Subunit: 259 residues, 2 copies
């Protein structure tokens, strides 16, 4: 499927390059465009801001779904609105609010069906973290692992997504996560930066700053399995990429692309 995974604090007032790319992929409203505010405790403000930005970018057929209870998440009206949409955008908030309210519900199945039909699923901040199978949950002392992870939506199968990556401790905790299971690709996305993931398992960077990619398959050793909460992480032979707009990544071969 088609994903847009956004690092948070994206431009909602100026050029809005990332949201413009989302609107472009969605078809500008040909089929209804849905904004899902589940993650936040301020769904009216947030819903209205995204509503205004997407109208300004040319999407007229827009609905904001305030799915805030599991009852709402099992309302078949919302199932049908999502499976018949031209695109879904998940706003920020808390990752566990998204999973605890949508996991196991009809809305969740609607998102997965839409995704499999080629409907663009986009999300920013928490709405980005939840796209991986196992996600990082937002305690982060430097050089230590105080990491909490949880199951996500699993739209992106073999990656751990971290956002707001120009924040103290995000590199360290994504590195902890990759060390715990080097099978997972670590993808740290800066604010006002995003990756667009294509059905052929490559993505392109879009936006103002950079995406840090942590590839643990080169790892020779680590002490993560022996580590106590106050002890310093050791790790040998991590592969790291930093990709700004114009670059991409082949996730099957784990190779950096210039576009």
């Amino acid at each position: 499927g088609n994903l847009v995974i956004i690092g948070g604090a994206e431009d909602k007032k100026g050029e809005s390059k990332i949201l413009k790319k989302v609107a472009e992929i969605a078809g500008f409203g040909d089929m209804e465009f849905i904004v899902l505010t589940t993650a936040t405790e301020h769904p009216v403000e947030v819903g209205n801001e995204y509503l205004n930005v997407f109208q300004r970018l040319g999407i007229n057929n827009i609905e904001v779904l305030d799915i805030s209870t599991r009852e709402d998440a099992n309302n078949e009206e919302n199932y049908y609105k999502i499976v018949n949409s031209g695109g879904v955008f998940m706003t920020g908030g808390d990752q566990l609010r998204i999973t605890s309210i949508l996991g196991g519900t009809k809305v969740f199945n609607a998102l997965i069906e839409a995704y499999l039909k080629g409907v663009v699923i986009a999300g920013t901040s928490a709405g980005a973290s939840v796209m991986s199978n196992t996600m990082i949950v937002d305690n982060d002392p430097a050089r230590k692992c105080t990491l909490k992870m949880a199951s996500g939506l699993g739209l992106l199968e073999e990656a751990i997504i971290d956002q707001h990556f120009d924040q103290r401790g995000r590199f360290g905790r994504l590195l902890c996560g990759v060390a715990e299971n080097p099978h997972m690709l670590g993808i740290g996305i800066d604010e006002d930066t995003a990756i667009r993931v294509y059905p052929d398992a490559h993505f392109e960077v879009v936006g103002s700053y950079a995406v840090t990619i942590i590839d643990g398959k080169s790892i020779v050793s680590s002490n993560v399995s022996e580590l106590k909460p106050d002890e310093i992480l050791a790790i040998a032979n991590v592969t790291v990429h930093v990709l700004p707009e114009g670059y991409g990544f082949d996730m099957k071969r784990r190779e950096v692309l210039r576009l």
Copy 2:
């Protein structure tokens, strides 16, 4: 060829593991131990603090050299104090003060001679930065290269040393430096953390946190040569190690060691 390269803000009040290791290597002042305060504009306070700490740790024969002019640096008295010392400790301060006052002087030659005879040379903060051939000068912006470098003492031939490394942006600028010339090994040292470098070109981590090692030889590409001051760095296939106390590094093979 014995170096102790300290990341700054080392423990001067408690266990003082790093300074105690410096004391052990120096021989506890059988030959005079020299504290060199050139880097700082507060040589009496800084000198006295190191004087009291090193006496508490068992060094009996200590002298603090307040070398603040090039005239002082060309006094044969200071040449002989250094070449006949049991160890030299360069305090923190500003790196360019060390090089601009000591470069081309008798004291510089004395430090190099003592080092070549096996006298331990230690330094912290600015005193650590100056040990590389090309050193980073302190003045930041995320994902950009605003790096300024300068000539150092060159006691550690193929490395760029960065200190206080848990401060925002140090990882990014050391990555810029390694990108500019992947021949150089990037060594970022945390506060109250150090490396002990041995004549056989391996070093051991001593201290409370970690040393980040950036090996650029694996780099596939970067855009650093085409980069304008406000543009985002791109880099592919950087190798990174993070080593806490008890780990070390073989600089000939670029391999992590566990000890």
